[PDB]
Structure 1
């Protein structure tokens, strides 16, 4: 129960989620939120912006006891640069990951 990432945020810190599920509530401009639950154990959030330079797609608030593996933007991108074909492979794997996930954005 701790709001961690908010929509429209340039995140230099993506997170890998280890314990407990989350809530990727896409805050609706009408006043409420999408109430979309963010998959927890062995999933992640706060990375799509890092992946494709969009603003933070959804507001995530920790719902269960969460241990995370927060990853910095700078070094992650640098490692992408070092491992280029691997990095492009991660980009593609992100597309495939959310192809069946049917993510909103």
Structure 2
């Protein structure tokens, strides 16, 4: 998995993964902080987890074989490693 990886930097305000669309790349967080966000059935977005250190998201979609449980938007400049 390491020999096939790429890094990327996202400025605040961006969205890395939307809950609606299926995952195609899962991102391992190595620096920065970012927030997990399930589209709330109330008509809003609420807040779940603040994934800052040595954490990944999108894998649970690759295991459950369903759509992304949470939309994930950035918080600050984050050094993310990405695998398809």
User: Per the shorter chain, which TM-score range?
Assistant: 0.7 to 0.9
**2: CA distance between counterparts of 1:48 and 1:65?**
24
How far 1:51 moved relative to its partner? Answer: 2.1
* Larger strand proportion of the pair: 2
**2: CA distance between counterparts of 1:61 and 1:53?**
21
* Worse-matched range after superposition: 33-42 or 61-70: 33-42
SS in 1 for 2:73: strand
Greater relative contact order: 1 or 2 (C-alpha under 8 angstroms, separation 6 or more)? Answer: 2
Structure with the greater alpha carbon radius of gyration: 1
- RMSD in angstroms over aligned alpha carbons? 1.3
Give the paired residue count.
72
Could you list the runs of 5+ residues in structure 1 that have no partner in the other structure? 73-105
Q: TM-score, normalised by structure 1?
A: 0.62
Question: Runs of 4+ in structure 1 displaced over 4 angstroms?
Answer: none
**2: CA distance between counterparts of 1:17 and 1:51?**
19
* Worse-matched range after superposition: 41-50 or 29-38: 29-38
Q: TM-score, normalised by structure 2?
A: 0.75
